[PDB]
Each structure stands twice: as C-alpha cells, then as structure tokens.
Design a protein around this ligand. Structure first.
Ligand SMILES: CCC1=C(C)/C(=C/C2=NC(=C\c3[nH]c(/C=C4\NC(=O)[C@H](C)[C@H]4CC)c(C)c3CCC(=O)O)/C(CCC(=O)O)=C2C)NC1=O
Ligand SMILES: CCC1=C(C)/C(=C/C2=NC(=C\c3[nH]c(/C=C4\NC(=O)[C@H](C)[C@H]4CC)c(C)c3CCC(=O)O)/C(CCC(=O)O)=C2C)NC1=O
Lengths: 178, 178
C-alpha cells in the first residue's frame, strides 16, 4: 500500500521553496520556527546565533501562549555558555544533534539547569546550523509543559531544517557577491 | 549522546545546494541519481517523465555495471503503462510513494511482471515528482540482483529527493519568466 505525504517532508520542502524565492532570511526564520512548532506541538522553537567569542543570542523564535517571549523589538536574550565557549561550540562543532527527553536525566551542571529552569525548559532537541564550513548557531525545539519522549522523525526533521537554515545563510552570503 | 550526520540528510542538503547554484536540471538529475544509487547500494536509479497522455520515458539514470543502459544518446526507453494512463498517474497522482521488497509478492499482472523482468527488476521504491500541482513523473530505485527488505529511511530519502526534483523543475519554469 501507498505511503501518504509526511508532515516533516512537506515542511522541509516548503522551506526549500522559501529559500529559492524569499531573500529576507529573518522572515524565513520567523515563519519556519512557527511551522516547526506547530508540527512538533512543542512550546518554543528558536534560532540561536553565535558571536565570534562563542557567546550568542536568540535571533528568531515561535513561542506558545503563556511562555515568555525571548525575541522581539527592544529585547535581546543572550546566553553566554562557558562550556560552549571553552570548546568552541561543543558537540555541535562536529555536526552532532542532541535529544533530551528530560533535563534532569541528562547530567547537566546545576548552573546550566538553573538557566534551563529560567526558560521553563523540560525537554529539548538541539541541532547545528552550519554556514559554509563554520558553526553559525543552533536551532532548538523545547517542551516547557513537561518531559517528552521525542521520536526519530522529530529529531531528523529538526536536523534537516537546521541544514536548510545553514544553506539559506550561506546562499545570502554568496549572492553578495554584490 | 550526539547524533552524527546521516547520509540521506547530507545528500538531500547537497541536492538543495545544486538547485540554488546549477541551472542545468539534466545535470542535477544525472549527478543526483548517481549519489542516490551509491547511498542505497542499489542497481538502478531513474527519473521517468510523463507525456500528456500519461505514457512516459526514462530521462535520467544511474546504473551499475552489468545492467542494461536505458538512458543515453540515441536511446529512448519508453514505458506506456495502461494502468497509469487509465488512472492518470495511479496512486502517484495522490502523492503516494510505493515500496516493493519482492515484485512477485505485490500482486502485479503478468504483463507488468514481464516488463519488470525485462529490466531485471526484483524490488523497488517509486516516488512522485510533482511540478507545480501537476504529477510530472516518477523517481524510482531498483534492486536487480535480488529481493530487498527496504527500510524507512530509504523510502523517506527517495521521497524527499522526488520533492526536490519537483521544486527544481517548478523553479526553472518560474525563472522563465524570461
Ligand atoms: C540554543 C540555546 C541553548 C544554549 C546556548 C544551550 C547551552 C548549553 N550548555 C551546555 C553545557 C554546559 N554548560 C555549562 C556551564 C554553564 N552554562 C552557563 O550558562 C553558565 C555560564 C555556566 C556555569 C559554569 C556546562 C558546565 C556544561 C557542560 C555540562 C552540562 O551538560 O551541564 C550544553 C551542552 C549539552 C550537550 O550538547 O551535551 C548546551 C547545548 N542550550 C540551549 O538550548
Ligand atoms: C518509473 C518507471 C515505472 C513504471 C512506468 C511503472 C509502471 C507501473 N505499472 C503499474 C501497474 C499496472 N500496469 C498494468 C498493465 C500494463 N502495464 C504495461 O506495461 C502493459 C501495457 C499493461 C498490460 C495490460 C496493470 C494492469 C497494472 C495494475 C496491476 C499491477 O499492479 O500489475 C504500476 C502500479 C504499482 C502501484 O503503484 O501499485 C506501476 C508503477 N513502474 C515503474 O517502475
């Protein structure tokens, strides 16, 4: 019997069309984080951009009602993570994605737990965004309402959109090139 | 622990870069069918294009040594399939993909089996290629050496490249638009 279209495949395909047709990458990030958050039924999806010193800030997001807005006019949410700085991007530098069903089961340090608790994160998936051969930032999906048993299609989907964001950034650089 | 890059994800991402940078869609089909065939370790990967009457022909392929070449200069391999014609594209019109581990276990008619046997096909995956809202053709992976227990990542991968071929064709149309 046939295999009908899958949500993740159709969402990734839609991102590709936007990259082909939309020059405003901010707008691609804003609409795409929204589409991802709807498909994953999670509480926040965010793009985090590294600074040269490996600190960074949230630059785009979609967030459900009842959770704090971390991106917007006259807001700048910075996270200067000393592990990511010391290691120049952690495992993400090696193009690894990471899946955490329960932040209390991951062996995080308490100062890291504190920040996760501040953003009300209970479970997450984090993937790399590479532009050219450099780690440019991270794309993350968060569950704030409770723990979550993420499945393979969900982590693969988020990884694939991270690749597409990377291509979007790279292509914009290429086009300019004036 | 981290999830390292997956072959299918990196291959789909490479196709997207080609679509952004390469105007020659023939060339995208030829190099991409080769990449797919290597990753799937199968014997033939082919793009089949429909004519207005729902007959069609193979327009690009990668094929292993020892199997017949069906695409090339001064060759035209047509398959006029009466089921696909009568139904205007079969299940593929509804954007369904199809996975067959063993052609003898699928309930095919003997005249269909005959053609499959002519091309030495034992097992296959077939996916749609849509350009705009129209079924433009099919992208197929074939095992000729024996039956094959295809797995989910393989069918998802082929489906995703079918979507990307569709976007490639659509975008080329859009750009012309002169
Ligand atoms: C996309 C936004 C985002 C960021 C930036 C983030 C940071 C972050 N901090 C990490 C680890 C870490 N972070 C810290 C430490 C600290 N962290 C601090 O903010 C303090 C300044 C300092 C206290 C000393 C340490 C010690 C680790 C490694 C141990 C652990 O996993 O907690 C990890 C590693 C998890 C892994 O891949 O194993 C991430 C992803 N998570 C996110 O979702
Ligand atoms: C990409 C290249 C390619 C093509 C075109 C192809 C054709 C093809 N013929 C099909 C069915 C069919 N084809 C035919 C009949 C015929 N077929 C003929 O070539 C004769 C003219 C005629 C004899 C009457 C019939 C009766 C069916 C439906 C029953 C069956 O599954 O065999 C199906 C349906 C399988 C499904 O989705 O269930 C396909 C995909 N397979 C491929 O890999």
């Amino acid at each position: 019997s046939g295999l009908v279209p899958r949500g993740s495949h159709m969402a990734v395909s839609k991102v590709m069309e936007k990259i082909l047709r939309v020059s405003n990458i901010d707008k691609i990030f804003q609409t795409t984080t929204q589409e991802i958050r709807q498909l994953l039924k999670c509480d926040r999806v965010a793009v985090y951009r590294f600074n040269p010193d490996w600190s960074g800030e949230f630059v785009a997001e979609s967030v459900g009602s009842g959770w704090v807005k971390l991106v917007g006019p006259d807001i700048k949410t910075v996270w200067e993570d000393t592990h990511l700085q010391e290691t120049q991007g952690g495992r993400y530098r090696h193009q690894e994605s990471f899946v955490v069903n329960d932040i209390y089961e991951a062996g995080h340090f308490s100062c890291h737990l504190e920040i996760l608790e501040q953003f009300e994160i209970k479970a997450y998936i984090i993937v790399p965004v590479f532009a050219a051969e450099k780690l440019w930032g991270l794309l993350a999906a968060y569950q704030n309402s409770g723990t979550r048993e993420w499945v393979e299609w969900e982590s693969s989907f988020l990884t694939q959109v991270g690749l597409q964001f990377g291509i979007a950034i790279s292509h914009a650089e290429y086009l300019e090139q004036t």
